[PDB]
């Protein structure tokens, strides 16, 4: 197998044999095969908008194809088989209008040779051989490879809440449309320069998906608000949801109402508690554990049903005894897991059965007491402007850093913990995405009343962190955004933080520390061209770092 998409990748360069995350060979194959189709898909999609008969039929195929291969997002070939096959299907009826526009408009029938990606057909039984050909080594040159697959890795990210947008009934046709403008991109022979225009537009589109899914989110369920989040535990039995997807919380909620069924979030469903619209569900407890990297334990000591909502989901230890329990829904999968069905339209998924085995199960392991503090959104935090610029004037922030993005599993990150806890304490630390976990449940006060550590939610909300970055530009009538006294010590996993990057970039963001470390997927050429154009760092040490960001470099 050849796969490098995330930060834990082997040796920092691929995993060759079996994935770091668990994901053996044949599932890593089957996803390179999907999204081979997709680029075929992808081919005659843009050929159709191209002829001014565009066709979006696939639309949502397409984004969830995407997402299912992020980084601990669906682990079930059967999954993977099905959605190849019904992309052939997809693909073959693109094919077929394709050519009768084609000849309606050239007067001659359609000629030229096309990657295989756009021809290539069999049945289940030829996916596992064929697979193996037409991933990320069929791509010779490093810096070809390194652009083509750093613009799909950014794609499956803007894919993702492209989806969850999609699911709140909000979309944007530049978005589908850039879908196969990229995906097609890497089936053709460009230049560098072609090619990372291709990237920074994909940074554009970022910014777009992540203000559409913001406004989604704030639309169908408010503006996030200051909450105090318990920790602890109640009595009752619980189903505990993680992942990213409101929609799924706001039907839960709905469903568990009255049941004496408690909900609990973990993970990324943790900003679901600074929703008006969830906080008032007197059943809604709180927030169980940490990040996704321990939730085998964590898991297996909530006692009741898990429902995960997108990624990061990750294999079941062999004493894990929570299998019968676990619940998939949307593009997420799992042998062996109970999936819960996509919503019809106008209509709602069924959640019942975890509601029923809720009821069988003791409540939760209390793991720890207190709470986490959480809700400052652009709406708040913009909401605060006067109240931050006057504390800036006077000096009693003395900077801001943003530690958004990804946590993951090497101990290495305990830099983020460290530098948190050693920044000085006239500065306020913003932050979005799971990275928050490192940080988030020290003690470390405020300044005049603003917290030292403010969540706008969840990775998307990165997006919230940028509308503050760009309102504060304004109000310090500074031409370069760079110029605020702001640091980004951006912490990476998968594939959405990498859209985050991307929108940075695209947004003029230069001097980003990202770590813990650097992307295996950036070719050397590729990585000075970053450097050069938006001088993107490594993680030194606590101290280093430190000092660095209070001198702003
Ligand atoms: S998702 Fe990450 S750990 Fe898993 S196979 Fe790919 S690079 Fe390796
Ligand atoms: Fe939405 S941030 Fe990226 S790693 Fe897996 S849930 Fe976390």
Redesign the pocket.
Known sequence: MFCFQCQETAKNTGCTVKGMCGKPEETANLQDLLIFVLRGIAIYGEKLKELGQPDRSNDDFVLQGLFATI??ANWDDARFEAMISEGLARRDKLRNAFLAVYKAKNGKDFSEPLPEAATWTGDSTAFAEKAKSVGILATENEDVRSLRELLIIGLKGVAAYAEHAAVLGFRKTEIDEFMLEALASTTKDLSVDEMVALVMKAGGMAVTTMALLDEANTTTYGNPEITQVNIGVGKNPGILIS??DLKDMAELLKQTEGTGVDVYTH??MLPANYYPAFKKYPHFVGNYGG??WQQNPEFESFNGPILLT???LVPLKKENTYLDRLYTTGVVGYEGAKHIADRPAGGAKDFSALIAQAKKCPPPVEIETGSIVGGFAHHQVLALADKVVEAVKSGAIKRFVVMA????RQKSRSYYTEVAENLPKDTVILTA???KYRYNKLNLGDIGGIPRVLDAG???DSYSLAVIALKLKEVFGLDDINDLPVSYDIA???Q??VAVLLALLFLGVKGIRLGPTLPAFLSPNVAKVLVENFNIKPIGTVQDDIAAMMAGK
Do not use: L
């Not at 993005?405 to 993951?408: E, T």
């Open positions: 980084t601990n992942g990213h993970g990324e990040s996704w997108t990624n990061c993005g990804c946590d993951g995405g799971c990275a969840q990775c998307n990476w996993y998968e959405k933080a």
